[PDB]
Every structure is written in structure tokens, then in C-alpha cells.
Write a protein that binds this DNA or RNA. Sequence first.
RNA 1: GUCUC
RNA 2: GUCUC
Lengths: 93, 91, 91
Amino acid sequence: ADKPVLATKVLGTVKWFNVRNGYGFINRNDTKEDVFVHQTAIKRNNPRKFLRSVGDGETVEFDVVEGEKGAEATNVTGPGGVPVKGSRYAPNR
Amino acid sequence: KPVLATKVLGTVKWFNVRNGYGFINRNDTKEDVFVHQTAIKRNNPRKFLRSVGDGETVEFDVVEGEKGAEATNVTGPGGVPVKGSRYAPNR
Amino acid sequence: KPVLATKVLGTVKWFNVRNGYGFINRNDTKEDVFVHQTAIKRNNPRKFLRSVGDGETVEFDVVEGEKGAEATNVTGPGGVPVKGSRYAPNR
RNA sequence: GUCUC
RNA sequence: GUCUC
């Protein structure tokens, strides 16, 4: 869980996230490239949802690490470290 | 490079605008074919960057590259321009 | 310019033909080095512009230039010609 | 767990 | 000619 750090505190827009499969892609607002995001990377989840998720089109803040199969998001939160909004496909508690 | 099919319809799966490549899913064979920026024949006239967009229907020829099938002469259906990526600014 | 390493194998991370530069990730140290189009020693004869291509394996020396570690005498593995970039048109 | 419930 | 066609 110690993967090299390529960039820190990057702002991105969730392109899409699939709750069933537990991954999606965030598009970096600076470079407009996609970054793979797994459901385990989400640090400050929506407290009203049990499952970890981000929702399509949501603004998120994160670090980029060199993952096992490419660049990966980690430490994903809302802007300024607030909880994410979560996917509308992730059920509320 | 040998021609494997002409005038096929496919759905763009994703396209990376920072480095200019993505993949198309052919609607007949459901295989994936690589698409490079340089293979787009009829680009969106309103955008400077040459690109295609996720989910877009495109029409293309398919050739055999080193590492797999590649799209070429890529257009929108009927030869009209592609829509291009949401991540490529308009002029 | 002082030499930091000779005969390094690396993988092109990206190379922009329009601006004439890119980065190579060294296969031994996994560090990035800058490469300018003037540093390519064995270009692909069948492309007009000088370039290397995304994901290609290159062999080079590492010098320290004005703005950081820099790649020089860039060839393909063993000194053969590089493959070059898809963005560099073929003759 | 790399282009979708 | 130091993170982009």
C-alpha cells in the first residue's frame, strides 16, 4: 500500500463510477486525463451511505500514485477534505 | 498495413486527449480496435484538438497493426465529422 | 555537459512531436529523464520529423543539462533506429 | 480492481 | 527546448 507518488492534491471530475463493480475514472481538471479509482481509495465517504463510492460528475480531490496496472487515485475526498457526495447508485443507510 | 474491414460502425469506448489515443468497440464483431488521433479523417471543425468522444458512434476502416487491429479513416456515420471529446475545448 | 550514465535502457513515457520533447522513464532506476528531439541519434529513416514514440524502448546516456537530467545519444535498443512517433508522418 | 450497476 | 500535438 506504499505506491510511488506522482502528484498530490489534484482536483478532478468523476467521469463515471460503477458501484456494483466498485471502480471508475476521475478526469483531472488540470491535465484532462483519466485516473483509475477503486472503491477502496475513497477516504472521506458520504456518512449516510454504507458503501464507499463517488458519483458521476462530482468534484473530488486526491493524490495520484503509481498503481499496479497504472496511475491510480488515492486519499479521495471532496474539495478541501469534506466527504464526497457518493454515487446515487450507492444506497443510503 | 493489410485491410481487415472497410466502412464498419463502432462505439467509442474511451479516448485520452492528453496523449491522443483510445479504443473503439466494433458493433459487428464486438472486438476492440485501437484508434489514434492521426487516424481521424473528419474531425470536429469547431475544436482545434483532434479527438473522438466516449460513447460516440463512428465509422471507419480496420487495419492490422503490430499489436492488434487499428481503426483508420475515422468519421462519424455517413462520413459526417465526429463529435470529438468533451475534454477537447471548442474554439 | 557532465555524464551521469551510459547505455541506459528506458521506456518512452510520452513524446510530443509538435513541441519536440518528452520524457523517458529509466528501466533501471525508474526515474524520468527529459529528451529533446535534437538528442535522437538514430531516427526512423521512414519518418520526416525526428521523434520517439509512446511506450517504445530506447537506449541512451544520461547527462546533466541546464534544466535537469537529460537523455542524449538516443537510439533503439542496442543502437538500432528508434521506431518514432505515430504523430510523425511517414514518407 | 482499467471503460459501467 | 522540462508535462503536451
